[PDB]
Short mmCIF file of N, CA and C in Angstrom, two decimals:
data_model
loop_
_atom_site.label_atom_id
_atom_site.label_comp_id
_atom_site.label_asym_id
_atom_site.label_seq_id
_atom_site.Cartn_x
_atom_site.Cartn_y
_atom_site.Cartn_z
N UNK A 9 -112.59 -92.97 -120.56
CA UNK A 9 -113.71 -93.35 -121.40
C UNK A 9 -114.96 -93.48 -120.53
N UNK A 10 -116.03 -92.84 -121.00
CA UNK A 10 -117.40 -92.86 -120.41
C UNK A 10 -118.37 -93.06 -121.57
N UNK A 11 -119.54 -93.66 -121.33
CA UNK A 11 -120.48 -93.92 -122.46
C UNK A 11 -120.85 -92.59 -123.12
N UNK A 12 -120.75 -92.52 -124.46
CA UNK A 12 -119.84 -93.40 -125.24
C UNK A 12 -118.73 -92.55 -125.87
N UNK A 13 -117.46 -92.91 -125.62
CA UNK A 13 -116.33 -92.16 -126.20
C UNK A 13 -115.01 -92.78 -125.73
N UNK A 14 -113.88 -92.45 -126.37
CA UNK A 14 -112.61 -92.99 -125.90
C UNK A 14 -111.51 -91.99 -126.18
N UNK A 15 -110.66 -91.75 -125.19
CA UNK A 15 -109.56 -90.81 -125.31
C UNK A 15 -108.30 -91.41 -124.71
N UNK A 16 -107.17 -91.21 -125.38
CA UNK A 16 -105.89 -91.74 -124.92
C UNK A 16 -104.80 -90.75 -125.28
N UNK A 17 -103.95 -90.42 -124.30
CA UNK A 17 -102.85 -89.49 -124.51
C UNK A 17 -101.59 -90.06 -123.86
N UNK A 18 -100.50 -90.09 -124.62
CA UNK A 18 -99.22 -90.61 -124.14
C UNK A 18 -98.13 -89.61 -124.51
N UNK A 19 -97.26 -89.30 -123.55
CA UNK A 19 -96.17 -88.37 -123.76
C UNK A 19 -94.91 -88.93 -123.12
N UNK A 20 -93.80 -88.88 -123.85
CA UNK A 20 -92.52 -89.41 -123.38
C UNK A 20 -91.41 -88.46 -123.79
N UNK A 21 -90.51 -88.16 -122.85
CA UNK A 21 -89.39 -87.26 -123.11
C UNK A 21 -88.25 -87.61 -122.18
N UNK A 22 -87.05 -87.77 -122.74
CA UNK A 22 -85.86 -88.07 -121.96
C UNK A 22 -84.69 -87.28 -122.52
N UNK A 23 -83.74 -86.94 -121.65
CA UNK A 23 -82.55 -86.21 -122.05
C UNK A 23 -81.33 -86.81 -121.37
N UNK A 24 -80.17 -86.66 -122.02
CA UNK A 24 -78.91 -87.18 -121.50
C UNK A 24 -77.79 -86.27 -121.95
N UNK A 25 -76.92 -85.87 -121.01
CA UNK A 25 -75.80 -85.00 -121.31
C UNK A 25 -74.58 -85.46 -120.54
N UNK A 26 -73.43 -85.50 -121.22
CA UNK A 26 -72.18 -85.92 -120.61
C UNK A 26 -71.04 -85.16 -121.26
N UNK A 27 -70.11 -84.68 -120.43
CA UNK A 27 -68.95 -83.94 -120.91
C UNK A 27 -67.73 -84.35 -120.09
N UNK A 28 -66.60 -84.51 -120.76
CA UNK A 28 -65.35 -84.91 -120.11
C UNK A 28 -64.19 -84.16 -120.74
N UNK A 29 -63.34 -83.58 -119.90
CA UNK A 29 -62.16 -82.85 -120.35
C UNK A 29 -61.00 -83.18 -119.43
N UNK A 30 -59.84 -83.45 -120.04
CA UNK A 30 -58.65 -83.84 -119.29
C UNK A 30 -57.44 -83.10 -119.82
N UNK A 31 -56.61 -82.60 -118.91
CA UNK A 31 -55.39 -81.89 -119.26
C UNK A 31 -54.30 -82.27 -118.27
N UNK A 32 -53.09 -82.46 -118.78
CA UNK A 32 -51.95 -82.90 -117.99
C UNK A 32 -50.76 -81.99 -118.25
N UNK A 33 -49.98 -81.72 -117.21
CA UNK A 33 -48.83 -80.85 -117.33
C UNK A 33 -47.56 -81.44 -116.74
N UNK A 34 -46.50 -81.50 -117.55
CA UNK A 34 -45.22 -82.04 -117.11
C UNK A 34 -44.10 -81.45 -117.96
N UNK A 35 -43.10 -80.87 -117.31
CA UNK A 35 -41.93 -80.35 -118.00
C UNK A 35 -40.74 -80.37 -117.05
N UNK A 36 -39.55 -80.54 -117.62
CA UNK A 36 -38.31 -80.60 -116.85
C UNK A 36 -37.27 -79.72 -117.52
N UNK A 37 -36.39 -79.14 -116.70
CA UNK A 37 -35.33 -78.28 -117.21
C UNK A 37 -34.23 -78.17 -116.16
N UNK A 38 -32.98 -78.13 -116.62
CA UNK A 38 -31.85 -78.00 -115.73
C UNK A 38 -30.59 -77.51 -116.43
N UNK A 39 -29.81 -76.66 -115.76
CA UNK A 39 -28.60 -76.11 -116.33
C UNK A 39 -27.43 -76.35 -115.39
N UNK A 40 -26.25 -76.56 -115.97
CA UNK A 40 -25.04 -76.83 -115.21
C UNK A 40 -23.86 -76.15 -115.88
N UNK A 41 -23.17 -75.29 -115.15
CA UNK A 41 -22.02 -74.57 -115.67
C UNK A 41 -20.83 -74.77 -114.75
N UNK A 42 -19.64 -74.51 -115.27
CA UNK A 42 -18.42 -74.78 -114.53
C UNK A 42 -17.27 -73.97 -115.11
N UNK A 43 -16.30 -73.65 -114.25
CA UNK A 43 -15.10 -72.91 -114.63
C UNK A 43 -13.92 -73.53 -113.91
N UNK A 44 -12.73 -73.36 -114.50
CA UNK A 44 -11.53 -73.96 -113.93
C UNK A 44 -10.30 -73.24 -114.45
N UNK A 45 -9.22 -73.34 -113.68
CA UNK A 45 -7.90 -72.89 -114.08
C UNK A 45 -6.88 -73.86 -113.50
N UNK A 46 -5.92 -74.27 -114.33
CA UNK A 46 -4.94 -75.28 -113.95
C UNK A 46 -3.57 -74.84 -114.43
N UNK A 47 -2.61 -74.76 -113.51
CA UNK A 47 -1.25 -74.36 -113.84
C UNK A 47 -0.33 -75.57 -113.91
N UNK A 48 3.79 -80.01 -118.42
CA UNK A 48 3.78 -80.10 -119.87
C UNK A 48 2.36 -79.98 -120.42
N UNK A 49 2.22 -80.10 -121.74
CA UNK A 49 0.91 -80.02 -122.37
C UNK A 49 0.07 -81.26 -122.14
N UNK A 50 0.64 -82.33 -121.58
CA UNK A 50 -0.13 -83.54 -121.31
C UNK A 50 -1.18 -83.30 -120.24
N UNK A 51 -0.98 -82.29 -119.39
CA UNK A 51 -1.96 -81.96 -118.36
C UNK A 51 -3.24 -81.36 -118.90
N UNK A 52 -3.24 -80.93 -120.16
CA UNK A 52 -4.46 -80.39 -120.77
C UNK A 52 -5.56 -81.44 -120.87
N UNK A 53 -5.20 -82.72 -120.84
CA UNK A 53 -6.21 -83.77 -120.81
C UNK A 53 -7.10 -83.64 -119.58
N UNK B 9 -86.60 -87.06 -128.51
CA UNK B 9 -87.95 -86.84 -128.02
C UNK B 9 -88.93 -87.50 -128.97
N UNK B 10 -89.91 -88.21 -128.42
CA UNK B 10 -90.92 -88.90 -129.21
C UNK B 10 -92.27 -88.78 -128.52
N UNK B 11 -93.28 -88.32 -129.25
CA UNK B 11 -94.63 -88.15 -128.72
C UNK B 11 -95.61 -88.84 -129.65
N UNK B 12 -96.51 -89.64 -129.07
CA UNK B 12 -97.52 -90.37 -129.83
C UNK B 12 -98.86 -90.22 -129.14
N UNK B 13 -99.85 -89.70 -129.87
CA UNK B 13 -101.19 -89.50 -129.35
C UNK B 13 -102.20 -90.01 -130.37
N UNK B 14 -103.19 -90.77 -129.88
CA UNK B 14 -104.28 -91.28 -130.75
C UNK B 14 -105.63 -90.80 -130.21
N UNK B 15 -106.35 -90.00 -131.01
CA UNK B 15 -107.71 -89.49 -130.65
C UNK B 15 -108.59 -89.60 -131.89
N UNK B 16 -108.84 -90.84 -132.33
CA UNK B 16 -109.61 -91.30 -133.53
C UNK B 16 -108.73 -91.27 -134.79
N UNK B 17 -107.46 -90.88 -134.63
CA UNK B 17 -106.43 -90.81 -135.69
C UNK B 17 -105.10 -91.21 -135.04
N UNK B 18 -104.22 -91.90 -135.78
CA UNK B 18 -102.95 -92.33 -135.21
C UNK B 18 -101.87 -91.36 -135.63
N UNK B 19 -101.06 -90.93 -134.66
CA UNK B 19 -99.99 -89.98 -134.91
C UNK B 19 -98.74 -90.42 -134.16
N UNK B 20 -97.59 -90.37 -134.83
CA UNK B 20 -96.32 -90.75 -134.24
C UNK B 20 -95.23 -89.82 -134.73
N UNK B 21 -94.36 -89.40 -133.82
CA UNK B 21 -93.26 -88.51 -134.14
C UNK B 21 -92.00 -88.97 -133.42
N UNK B 22 -90.87 -88.89 -134.11
CA UNK B 22 -89.59 -89.30 -133.55
C UNK B 22 -88.51 -88.32 -133.99
N UNK B 23 -87.68 -87.89 -133.05
CA UNK B 23 -86.60 -86.96 -133.33
C UNK B 23 -85.38 -87.35 -132.52
N UNK B 24 -84.21 -87.37 -133.17
CA UNK B 24 -82.96 -87.72 -132.52
C UNK B 24 -81.85 -86.82 -133.06
N UNK B 25 -81.04 -86.30 -132.14
CA UNK B 25 -79.94 -85.42 -132.50
C UNK B 25 -78.70 -85.81 -131.70
N UNK B 26 -77.56 -85.89 -132.39
CA UNK B 26 -76.31 -86.27 -131.76
C UNK B 26 -75.21 -85.31 -132.20
N UNK B 27 -74.41 -84.84 -131.24
CA UNK B 27 -73.32 -83.92 -131.52
C UNK B 27 -72.12 -84.29 -130.67
N UNK B 28 -70.97 -84.45 -131.32
CA UNK B 28 -69.74 -84.80 -130.63
C UNK B 28 -68.58 -84.08 -131.30
N UNK B 29 -67.78 -83.37 -130.50
CA UNK B 29 -66.63 -82.63 -130.99
C UNK B 29 -65.44 -82.88 -130.08
N UNK B 30 -64.27 -83.05 -130.69
CA UNK B 30 -63.03 -83.31 -129.96
C UNK B 30 -61.94 -82.39 -130.48
N UNK B 31 -61.21 -81.76 -129.57
CA UNK B 31 -60.13 -80.85 -129.93
C UNK B 31 -58.97 -81.07 -128.98
N UNK B 32 -57.78 -81.31 -129.54
CA UNK B 32 -56.58 -81.54 -128.75
C UNK B 32 -55.38 -80.94 -129.46
N UNK B 33 -54.45 -80.39 -128.68
CA UNK B 33 -53.24 -79.79 -129.20
C UNK B 33 -52.05 -80.23 -128.37
N UNK B 34 -50.95 -80.54 -129.05
CA UNK B 34 -49.72 -80.98 -128.40
C UNK B 34 -48.57 -80.14 -128.95
N UNK B 35 -47.75 -79.61 -128.05
CA UNK B 35 -46.63 -78.77 -128.45
C UNK B 35 -45.45 -79.04 -127.53
N UNK B 36 -44.25 -78.72 -128.02
CA UNK B 36 -43.05 -78.79 -127.20
C UNK B 36 -41.96 -77.95 -127.86
N UNK B 37 -41.40 -77.00 -127.12
CA UNK B 37 -40.34 -76.17 -127.63
C UNK B 37 -39.16 -76.09 -126.68
N UNK B 38 -37.99 -76.53 -127.14
CA UNK B 38 -36.80 -76.58 -126.31
C UNK B 38 -35.66 -75.84 -126.98
N UNK B 39 -34.93 -75.07 -126.18
CA UNK B 39 -33.76 -74.33 -126.65
C UNK B 39 -32.63 -74.52 -125.64
N UNK B 40 -31.50 -75.04 -126.11
CA UNK B 40 -30.37 -75.30 -125.23
C UNK B 40 -29.08 -75.00 -125.98
N UNK B 41 -28.08 -74.50 -125.25
CA UNK B 41 -26.81 -74.13 -125.84
C UNK B 41 -25.71 -74.30 -124.80
N UNK B 42 -24.49 -74.56 -125.29
CA UNK B 42 -23.33 -74.74 -124.42
C UNK B 42 -22.14 -74.01 -125.02
N UNK B 43 -21.58 -73.08 -124.26
CA UNK B 43 -20.42 -72.30 -124.67
C UNK B 43 -19.22 -72.70 -123.82
N UNK B 44 -18.10 -73.01 -124.48
CA UNK B 44 -16.87 -73.37 -123.78
C UNK B 44 -15.73 -72.51 -124.32
N UNK B 45 -14.73 -72.27 -123.48
CA UNK B 45 -13.57 -71.46 -123.83
C UNK B 45 -12.34 -72.07 -123.17
N UNK B 46 -11.29 -72.29 -123.96
CA UNK B 46 -10.02 -72.79 -123.46
C UNK B 46 -8.90 -71.80 -123.76
N UNK B 47 -7.76 -72.03 -123.11
CA UNK B 47 -6.59 -71.16 -123.26
C UNK B 47 -5.36 -72.02 -123.00
N UNK B 48 -4.67 -72.42 -124.07
CA UNK B 48 -3.50 -73.27 -123.94
C UNK B 48 -2.35 -72.48 -123.31
N UNK B 49 -1.20 -73.13 -123.17
CA UNK B 49 -0.08 -72.53 -122.45
C UNK B 49 0.96 -71.97 -123.41
N UNK B 50 1.60 -72.84 -124.19
CA UNK B 50 2.68 -72.46 -125.10
C UNK B 50 3.72 -71.61 -124.36
N UNK B 51 4.44 -72.30 -123.47
CA UNK B 51 5.22 -71.72 -122.37
C UNK B 51 6.03 -70.49 -122.77
N UNK B 52 6.40 -70.37 -124.04
CA UNK B 52 7.19 -69.23 -124.48
C UNK B 52 6.41 -67.93 -124.31
N UNK B 53 7.15 -66.82 -124.21
CA UNK B 53 6.56 -65.51 -124.03
C UNK B 53 7.47 -64.46 -124.66
N UNK B 54 7.03 -63.20 -124.61
CA UNK B 54 7.61 -62.11 -125.38
C UNK B 54 8.25 -61.04 -124.50
N UNK B 55 9.04 -61.46 -123.51
CA UNK B 55 9.65 -60.52 -122.57
C UNK B 55 10.88 -59.87 -123.21
N UNK B 56 11.10 -60.15 -124.50
CA UNK B 56 12.28 -59.67 -125.22
C UNK B 56 12.58 -58.20 -124.93
#
């Protein structure tokens, strides 16, 4: 401002950004096989 | 964003935008099998 007049200017700007990603991995597996031969019928137990 | 300027007139502006998206998937597939085979004795045989 100078004689005679008045000027005023205001400017405001803000930004915000956020990102989140999560991934988890877990797995289990197992196999078991077997064979046999055995030479009364009570032994079949 | 908001801008306000006064030059013998009053002016005000306000703007707000919000966006949020969530996506999740859960899966599990299992296949298991067990095969067994026996062979009894029955001592008799066919040597006839």
